[PDB]
Amino acid sequence: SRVAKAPVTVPNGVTVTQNGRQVEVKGSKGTLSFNLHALVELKQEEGKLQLAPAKESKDAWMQAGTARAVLNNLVKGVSEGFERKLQLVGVGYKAAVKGTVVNLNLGYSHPIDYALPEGVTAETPTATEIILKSANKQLLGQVAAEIRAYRSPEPYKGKGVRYSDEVILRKEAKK
Amino acid sequence: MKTLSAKPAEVQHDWFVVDATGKTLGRLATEIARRLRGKHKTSYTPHVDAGDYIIVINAEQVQVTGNKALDKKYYRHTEFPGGLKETNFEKLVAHKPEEIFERAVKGMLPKGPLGYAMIKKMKVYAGSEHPHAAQQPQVLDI
Amino acid sequence: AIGLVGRKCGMTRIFTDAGVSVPVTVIEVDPNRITQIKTLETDGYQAVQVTTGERRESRVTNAQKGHFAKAGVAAGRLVKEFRVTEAELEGREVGGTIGVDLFTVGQIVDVTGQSKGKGFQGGVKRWNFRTQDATHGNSVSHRVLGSTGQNQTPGRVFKGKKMAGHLGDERVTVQGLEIVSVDTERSVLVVKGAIPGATGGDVIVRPTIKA
Amino acid sequence: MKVQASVKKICGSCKVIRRNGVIRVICSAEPRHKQRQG
RNA sequence: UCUAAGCGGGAAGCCUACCUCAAGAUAAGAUUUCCCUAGGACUUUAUGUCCUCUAAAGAGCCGUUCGAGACUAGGACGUUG
RNA sequence: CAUCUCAUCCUGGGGCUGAAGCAGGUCCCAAGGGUAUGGCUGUUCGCCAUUUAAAGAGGUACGCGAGCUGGGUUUAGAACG
RNA sequence: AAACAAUCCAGACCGCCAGCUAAGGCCCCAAAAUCAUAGUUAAGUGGGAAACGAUGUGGGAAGGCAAGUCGGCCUGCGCGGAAGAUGUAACGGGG
Ligand SMILES: [Mg+2]
Ligand SMILES: [Mg+2]
Ligand SMILES: [Mg+2]
Ligand SMILES: [Mg+2]
Ligand SMILES: [Mg+2]
Ligand SMILES: [Mg+2]
Ligand SMILES: [Mg+2]
Ligand SMILES: [Mg+2]
Ligand SMILES: [Mg+2]
Ligand SMILES: [Mg+2]
Ligand SMILES: [Mg+2]
Ligand SMILES: [Zn+2]
């Protein structure tokens, strides 16, 4: 696979140990873990992972590509994490990151208290704006999607919680 | 010379303990049924129970292949007008692994008084420990 | 949750200052005496076994004589268990008493009792069956069951079919009752509503499980 | 969603996917081109 | 690209949860308390047979009964009531 | 007096919409519970009146006369065309 | 062949605790291979069904463009299409 067969670059500073089928990526801003599929083994030169299948089957190449992509994300986020941005559209829609919770006002009869997990941190520069960040790309995406699920953008005016990198299907109601 | 039957008074039952960790359910149950019926002895008689006692430990670690952990259904009928009940292999093995082993083995045994007597000799335990150390079972590795 | 064992003494009414009349049942509560405590190491479950009332010594067998003498209680007319938790077992101990002050005014409780026995009853009284027409040519079947099944498929009567039989005299629980008053000098509970059984019958009062 | 026995691309933005042994059509252009075989 | 590896959300439906029954659950479960501790003989030498002494805890019969009940069963009591 | 099916009538959960909102249309999942009273007619049905969250579609010897009825139809009387 | 006049194998003179075979079978119920070698299937398909739909997966003969990629065929085995009334209930069952 072309995604595999390409070695991931380890920047200077992050360590990656391979105890067993487990793989631990320690960095300046996190300690992530990963499991290696039984059909793929690992080895460095000094600072470059080269994931390669064993037995050379199609399943093994698929799994090796998956392990390479996930380990590249792990190294990237443990060295310098990922961040996602949410934008709230519509009047009255406000957001406040207080403590480790997000208090959201999205046109409901009660404000929503979202509790961020231990990996993800949130911040608010403007009321109609959230910036989340973490080392875990998967966990960050999950938190962003669960927040967005509270009020998704509607086609008729775009009101709701949206990604900054998100194109909205717009509509209208011509009679 | 005529062919002799095993006398029930001289049948010698022996105790065995088998570990079910990571074994195929049906492929272990066939061997259990063969041992319980006494089919491995030269005194074998179809109307006599000359089988052995079989202790199954770690019964909740038995395995099925394919997608059977979710697809294998176990049914019951309470004999009430709509009372057909259904459970999963993985729900029942996390709740009653002894019922799984008993259902697997009882279907591979004869159906009658002798069959019930034969099923009485299979002792199934979900953990690593059984209470029959007084009986000193030998490790039957299948 | 630990409860009380009392006797249905009868029904009354309580007038509130605002003029509302409240139907109430009076439960007489002889203070319950703890006879035994069951724990996890000995029985496999935690419970408080309690006795109440009195029983003459010639009606007490030797087994129960010794069972009450092990504790420091006198023989009662019945023995009952309450399944409890830990931290509901702090100041409880054998030979102790559980009185009527275990409940508060306004607390919601469930009352369990033995309903009145009506003997053998037919479909009309036991299952709210409908009667057939009294006079439009109807023959000798007015309060009978009617059809009991179908024709040859299934060719039998299904289980759980509602027929005539013995009615009442069962254990019944009424949930959601309110404590109207707790008279600790008379050793009496007064609860709002109706409770199963006849006057003089044994009733179990527990804190409500709905919570 | 259209649940049909015949599923196929309609516009050029419709992708044919396989998910849990079900053939589906997901489209980014037109939400009305979503299809499931069934 | 929601899936192949991995991780989620998601219904008056399912399993629990609430109520009642329930160890004939022959796998017949558990806990507490209570009762029974005499001699011989004969061999078929073994939970062996017969004779004498014993008759417990308790259960029932019977009676007065019942808000329990077809009959039952169940509950209370029988003079220290 | 029922019991089952689901091809769902209501209530529950979703996709799309020629979905602004309200309300719909349509498809998917879902069988837990619920699911009229009358006038006419022997009627089933149907029409109508007034309700209802809804007044589902079926199977069960077109479920059910050793459970009831006997209005229709299909014995013998009688009459009309 | 679960059960099953008319299907398949086979035409019962009687006896036998003898042997060889037919159809059909050889994990257990239940006699005999948890036999051997090489492949295919992941659907419990096997163990019920069509037009039609699809980068499922194996093989073959070509073709175009040049770190290999594209889309056409012919086929093996699978997938959807596939809703019913007492109870799984469309391998006899366990599996
Ligand atoms: Mg008559
Ligand atoms: Mg009459
Ligand atoms: Mg029958
Ligand atoms: Mg449906
Ligand atoms: Mg009508
Ligand atoms: Mg009929
Ligand atoms: Mg008539
Ligand atoms: Mg046969
Ligand atoms: Mg031979
Ligand atoms: Mg065999
Ligand atoms: Mg083999
Ligand atoms: Zn499209």
mmCIF file of N, CA and C in Angstrom, chain A residues 1-8 40 50-53 60-69:
data_model
loop_
_atom_site.group_PDB
_atom_site.id
_atom_site.type_symbol
_atom_site.label_atom_id
_atom_site.label_comp_id
_atom_site.label_asym_id
_atom_site.label_seq_id
_atom_site.Cartn_x
_atom_site.Cartn_y
_atom_site.Cartn_z
ATOM 1 N N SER A 1 0.834 -1.196 0.000
ATOM 2 C CA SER A 1 0.000 0.000 0.000
ATOM 3 C C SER A 1 0.870 1.248 0.000
ATOM 4 N N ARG A 2 0.430 2.284 -0.709
ATOM 5 C CA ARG A 2 1.231 3.495 -0.828
ATOM 6 C C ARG A 2 1.255 4.309 0.456
ATOM 7 N N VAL A 3 0.181 4.272 1.245
ATOM 8 C CA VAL A 3 0.196 4.945 2.541
ATOM 9 C C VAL A 3 1.223 4.293 3.450
ATOM 10 N N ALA A 4 1.161 2.974 3.580
ATOM 11 C CA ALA A 4 2.270 2.224 4.151
ATOM 12 C C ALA A 4 3.414 2.272 3.141
ATOM 13 N N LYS A 5 4.500 1.560 3.418
ATOM 14 C CA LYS A 5 5.694 1.582 2.580
ATOM 15 C C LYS A 5 6.321 2.969 2.509
ATOM 16 N N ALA A 6 5.739 3.945 3.200
ATOM 17 C CA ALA A 6 6.309 5.270 3.379
ATOM 18 C C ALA A 6 6.607 5.436 4.861
ATOM 19 N N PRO A 7 7.821 5.814 5.246
ATOM 20 C CA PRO A 7 8.159 5.852 6.670
ATOM 21 C C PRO A 7 7.730 7.156 7.320
ATOM 22 N N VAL A 8 7.219 7.051 8.543
ATOM 23 C CA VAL A 8 6.774 8.236 9.266
ATOM 24 C C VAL A 8 7.992 8.938 9.850
ATOM 25 N N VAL A 40 0.981 -7.051 11.165
ATOM 26 C CA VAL A 40 1.913 -5.983 10.831
ATOM 27 C C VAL A 40 2.898 -5.771 11.971
ATOM 28 N N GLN A 50 9.059 2.337 10.131
ATOM 29 C CA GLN A 50 8.773 1.688 8.857
ATOM 30 C C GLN A 50 7.838 0.517 9.135
ATOM 31 N N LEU A 51 6.536 0.767 9.054
ATOM 32 C CA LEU A 51 5.562 -0.295 9.235
ATOM 33 C C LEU A 51 5.511 -1.169 7.995
ATOM 34 N N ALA A 52 5.523 -2.481 8.210
ATOM 35 C CA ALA A 52 5.564 -3.380 7.092
ATOM 36 C C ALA A 52 4.716 -4.588 7.433
ATOM 37 N N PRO A 53 3.960 -5.108 6.477
ATOM 38 C CA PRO A 53 3.177 -6.316 6.719
ATOM 39 C C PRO A 53 4.057 -7.545 6.831
ATOM 40 N N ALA A 60 -3.031 -7.857 5.110
ATOM 41 C CA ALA A 60 -1.886 -7.316 5.828
ATOM 42 C C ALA A 60 -1.506 -5.938 5.306
ATOM 43 N N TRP A 61 -1.615 -5.719 3.998
ATOM 44 C CA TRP A 61 -1.301 -4.400 3.459
ATOM 45 C C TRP A 61 -2.332 -3.365 3.889
ATOM 46 N N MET A 62 -3.610 -3.744 3.898
ATOM 47 C CA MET A 62 -4.646 -2.859 4.421
ATOM 48 C C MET A 62 -4.359 -2.466 5.867
ATOM 49 N N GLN A 63 -4.083 -3.458 6.713
ATOM 50 C CA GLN A 63 -3.823 -3.184 8.119
ATOM 51 C C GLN A 63 -2.542 -2.389 8.314
ATOM 52 N N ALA A 64 -1.547 -2.598 7.455
ATOM 53 C CA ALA A 64 -0.305 -1.849 7.570
ATOM 54 C C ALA A 64 -0.515 -0.390 7.204
ATOM 55 N N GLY A 65 -1.300 -0.125 6.162
ATOM 56 C CA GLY A 65 -1.654 1.251 5.860
ATOM 57 C C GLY A 65 -2.386 1.920 7.005
ATOM 58 N N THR A 66 -3.305 1.190 7.640
ATOM 59 C CA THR A 66 -4.030 1.749 8.777
ATOM 60 C C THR A 66 -3.083 2.067 9.929
ATOM 61 N N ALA A 67 -2.171 1.145 10.234
ATOM 62 C CA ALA A 67 -1.236 1.372 11.329
ATOM 63 C C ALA A 67 -0.295 2.529 11.023
ATOM 64 N N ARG A 68 0.135 2.662 9.769
ATOM 65 C CA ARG A 68 1.004 3.778 9.419
ATOM 66 C C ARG A 68 0.281 5.103 9.580
ATOM 67 N N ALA A 69 -0.962 5.191 9.100
ATOM 68 C CA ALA A 69 -1.690 6.450 9.215
ATOM 69 C C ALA A 69 -1.956 6.807 10.672
#
